Amino acid sequence: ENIISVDHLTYQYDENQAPALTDVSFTVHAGEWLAIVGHNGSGKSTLAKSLDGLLPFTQGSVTVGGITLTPETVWQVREQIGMIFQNPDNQFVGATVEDDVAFGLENRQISRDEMVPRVQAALAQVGMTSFAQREPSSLSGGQKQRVALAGIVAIAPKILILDEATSMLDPQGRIEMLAIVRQLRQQQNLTVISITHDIDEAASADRVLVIDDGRLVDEAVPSQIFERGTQLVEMGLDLPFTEKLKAALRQRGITPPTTYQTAAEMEEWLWQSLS
Amino acid sequence: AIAFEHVTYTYQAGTPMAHTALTDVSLTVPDRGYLAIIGHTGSGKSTLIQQLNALLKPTSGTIKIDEFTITPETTNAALKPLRQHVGMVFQFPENQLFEETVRQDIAFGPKNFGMADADALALADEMLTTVGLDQSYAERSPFELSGGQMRRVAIAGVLAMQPKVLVLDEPTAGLDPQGRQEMMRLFARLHQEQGLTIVLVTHQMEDVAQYAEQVAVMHEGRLMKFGTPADVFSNREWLQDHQLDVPQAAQFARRLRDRGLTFPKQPLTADQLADYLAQQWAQR
Amino acid sequence: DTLSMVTMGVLMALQLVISRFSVGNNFIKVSFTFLIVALIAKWFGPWWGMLTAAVVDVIGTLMTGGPFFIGFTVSAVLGSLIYAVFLYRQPVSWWRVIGASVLIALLVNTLLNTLWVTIMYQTPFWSLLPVRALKELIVTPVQIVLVYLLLKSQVIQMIQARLN
Amino acid sequence: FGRYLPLDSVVHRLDPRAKLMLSFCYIIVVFLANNIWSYAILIAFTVGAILSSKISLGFFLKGIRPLLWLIVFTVVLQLLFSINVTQDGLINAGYIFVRFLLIIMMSTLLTLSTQPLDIATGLASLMKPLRWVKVPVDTLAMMLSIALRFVPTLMDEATKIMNAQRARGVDFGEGGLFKQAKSLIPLMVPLFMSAFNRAEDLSTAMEARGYQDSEHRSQYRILTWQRRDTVTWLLFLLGFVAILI
């Protein structure tokens, strides 16, 4: 569980270097798939970092598991939050996969045996056992991401933060990664915050926070968010296909339902209106 | 035009640490064409594309691009002009900026093919706009910029070379939905005006349906199926086998077919689908 | 630290790459590794300078194919040392750089000389002394200019800020 | 990293940190050897080593290439100047030429018979007692580790930058020496930035994973001394006691 209260950030001179956040307040409950979406240059990127020690904000509060975000205590906060970053080429350390997945376990002064089956049982989850030997440059990126995930499953946290991760992957990279963030929740019951512009990701979330120019501007169930039509793209998401189709029907004189409609639901609407 | 004639490439000579990335490839893109190249990673997409400006020469076969002709025995020195006739925009092309101002960085390419210093500059100014920037950006350092702002500056610098062929390797990779859309439209504009021909490598099927004139499907160093997008997207299970799929609209349209709706051509875009739905609505 | 710690490691990786390379004609072609040694000294040295210098010279020689000799890694250490004293926490200067490179060149050629004249190979000292002093007296004005252009480039400055 | 450490299963090829000390001690035996019968030994074990290591043909010859420089310059200058050549002087070449090979072929062997990652894992051991002289070994072990995992990526990156610049003019290795250098800028200036950007991204991520100090943590990478670690060191030492004798 997190609580973020009256949060603001500016860096340097004199309003711009990083995207400013201003008076952001929101809360997340244990088990929640929260999506945070925004246009380019809003603080959604920055919101991700502030939840960890990265970024020293001088206004507002971040609390994670009772512990309140602060210096001399970031580490205890950081220890319940695993963070997959955007750009998988980086964020590695480790000549091989094992080494990496064990990097986290190392810092906790974990030693010897206990690491061996742990890192085994971590790669088993992200389906990467076969790749345990390989060097980072040797593999896809949608795979590099999974071994970052394995590296946080190893330390086995409460909260998994996804700062724009799918964002640099081919479609399979995307599809495969998401699926096992999903099946991860099925077992370990974890809290997933994800900063995004991926529809599928937001589509599989529980709530969506919408960040406009530095501020928390909207907050809803995602089937409700998607009713923003073409208006989606600027807001920071692409369009579901039914929403594209609706937009196209309107251009051609047909006015379709305003509420969201799944592909099944739209099918049935179409059929019934043409039967 | 571009014509591939029985082109095959193998890396590393006849020294059996040798691998062929391209085997007997033969294709033809017409003047003012829009080739989308499409297939799994390491299927020879990147190899085909590096052919086009002779960063690679074919191991066998001939390449013919307008006045240019490329054979195994073609000389590097004799091919310099091919690199201004064909503009290559690399994946994440932001990594090649280096000059101390963006004006100077755009101007670089022209300067490299001769071109008076003062004139190269003026052109960069012209180029800064087409790519979407205020002249405020001209005298800034490239490193003062958004990753997406750099992306335009880089692109600008290729466009500044005035190519006839524009090769784009995943031009919108790692960009926001808007950034994607703007970029793609920008090329389309450049294609309709200007009369360019565009070779596009993507994993983005929606894009192929929307902008492509012809699609090349590469499976494992081999190219199978040269067709209009309808031709390629005609068999879903065939495409599935080769680690690809049909556009979103095409899948949806199937479910409509299950309900008894029938269409003329198979819809590949929502506009196309809308068109047919609208026409049926008109009877009803 | 960490960012400083990581960046230095990246530079060390960078140093190994440039060491695989050379510009020239026949078998008179020089590596640009001296650039990275100067960079690190200027941003970090001489304590970290000498340390990293030692590690790179050793991990490096060992990975290429060359013969391990503790004096070369000594020789490497002085370079990062001379650079840092001249170039560390000081404004870049033509003389600053010039004096650093020259003090190094006379130990890139004297100190380095004896190291193979010693017991590694028999090779006669006062007879190789010319050829080195010949060779490494013409690379010098290149090294001077290059180090200067590197440290006063807008790139390095850009980063230098980001590290502070 | 330098397509070197070729996987030969058959060759005894183990216990790295033995070989580092072994390759570092091997030089001191050379000039400890003065006599002539002594030289037989220094070839005996050195042949034994080379042979047993199943590493073949001109690999060792390709090691000699960059030092031909000296090898000719030396032996010639020792033939003349000892311009009259003594009967003894030709004898000296039999030392130096042989001596030159012994140095070159030994150090070549080490590089060819060890993975750099294993070399790195190995050095970290044989520096660990420098902590008692206040040398930050573990952080240095980390710096190098970082250094070794970036080498291939910076390499992959260096080629992509080169290609991209090539794709817009710029002739790498063409038409001069100043011009040839001047063109390195479009490679170098970008590469640096890529590196420093990569640095920053990696450091933060390292922090996001728990980190704070080089020390006060574990080693997942473990070195096991084995049977050969012991004997392929006696076999050296029976050779060494002979050099005394």
Curated annotation (Swiss-Prot), chain A:
EC number: 7.-.-.-
Topology with respect to the bilayer: Peripheral membrane protein
Signal sequence range: none
Chief location: membrane
GO function term, MF aspect, one: ATPase-coupled transmembrane transporter activity
Entries under Gene3D superfamilies matching the protein: P-loop containing nucleotide triphosphate hydrolases
Subunit structure: Forms a stable energy-coupling factor (ECF) transporter complex composed of 2 membrane-embedded substrate-binding proteins (S component), 2 ATP-binding proteins (A component) and 2 transmembrane proteins (T component).
UniProt-recorded name of the protein: Energy-coupling factor transporter ATP-binding protein EcfA1
UniProt source species: Levilactobacillus brevis (strain ATCC 367 / BCRC 12310 / CIP 105137 / JCM 1170 / LMG 11437 / NCIMB 947 / NCTC 947)
Organism phylogeny: Bacteria, Bacillati, Bacillota, Bacilli, Lactobacillales
UniProtKB/Swiss-Prot annotation, chain B:
Membrane topology: Peripheral membrane protein
Matching PROSITE patterns: ABC_TRANSPORTER_1, ABC_TRANSPORTER_2, CBIO
Subcellular location: Cell membrane
The protein's enzyme class: translocase
Keyword line: ATP-binding, Cell membrane, Membrane, Nucleotide-binding, Translocase, Transport
Source taxon at top rank: Bacteria
Membrane-spanning parts: none
InterPro entries documented for this protein: AAA+_ATPase (IPR003593), ABC_transporter-like_ATP-bd (IPR003439), ABC_transporter-like_CS (IPR017871), ABC_transpr_CbiO/EcfA_su (IPR015856), ECF_ABC_transporter_ATP-bd (IPR050095), EcfA2 (IPR030946), P-loop_NTPase (IPR027417)
Gene Ontology CC: ATP-binding cassette (ABC) transporter complex
EC number of this enzyme: 7.-.-.-
Annotated ABC transporter domain residues: 2-245
GO molecular-function terms, A-Z: ATP binding; ATP hydrolysis activity; ATPase-coupled transmembrane transporter activity
UniProt cross-references to Gene3D superfamilies, sorted A to Z: P-loop containing nucleotide triphosphate hydrolases (3.40.50.300)
Family recorded in the similarity comment: Belongs to the ABC transporter superfamily. Energy-coupling factor EcfA family.
Subunit structure comment from the entry: Forms a stable energy-coupling factor (ECF) transporter complex composed of 2 membrane-embedded substrate-binding proteins (S component), 2 ATP-binding proteins (A component) and 2 transmembrane proteins (T component).
Annotated function: ATP-binding (A) component of a common energy-coupling factor (ECF) ABC-transporter complex. Unlike classic ABC transporters this ECF transporter provides the energy necessary to transport a number of different substrates.
Name the record gives this protein: Energy-coupling factor transporter ATP-binding protein EcfA2
From Swiss-Prot, chain D:
UniProt-listed Pfam families: CbiQ
InterPro entries registered for this protein in UniProt: ABC/ECF_trnsptr_transmembrane, ECF_transporter_component, EcfT
Molecular function GO labels: transmembrane transporter activity
CDD domains associated with the record: EcfT
Domain of life: Bacteria
Signal peptide annotation: none
Record-annotated membrane-spanning stretches: 27-47, 66-82, 90-110, 135-155, 229-245
Assigned keywords, A-Z: Cell membrane, Membrane, Transmembrane, Transmembrane helix, Transport
Topology term for the membrane: Multi-pass membrane protein
Subcellular location: Cell membrane
GO cellular component: plasma membrane
Family stated for the protein in its record: Belongs to the energy-coupling factor EcfT family.
Record text on subunit structure and interactions: Forms a stable energy-coupling factor (ECF) transporter complex composed of 2 membrane-embedded substrate-binding proteins (S component), 2 ATP-binding proteins (A component) and 2 transmembrane proteins (T component). May be able to interact with more than 1 S component at a time.
Function: Transmembrane (T) component of an energy-coupling factor (ECF) ABC-transporter complex. Unlike classic ABC transporters this ECF transporter provides the energy necessary to transport a number of different substrates.
Alphabetized PANTHER family for the sequence: SLL0384 PROTEIN (PTHR34857:SF2)
Name assigned to this protein: Energy-coupling factor transporter transmembrane protein EcfT
Organism: Levilactobacillus brevis (strain ATCC 367 / BCRC 12310 / CIP 105137 / JCM 1170 / LMG 11437 / NCIMB 947 / NCTC 947)
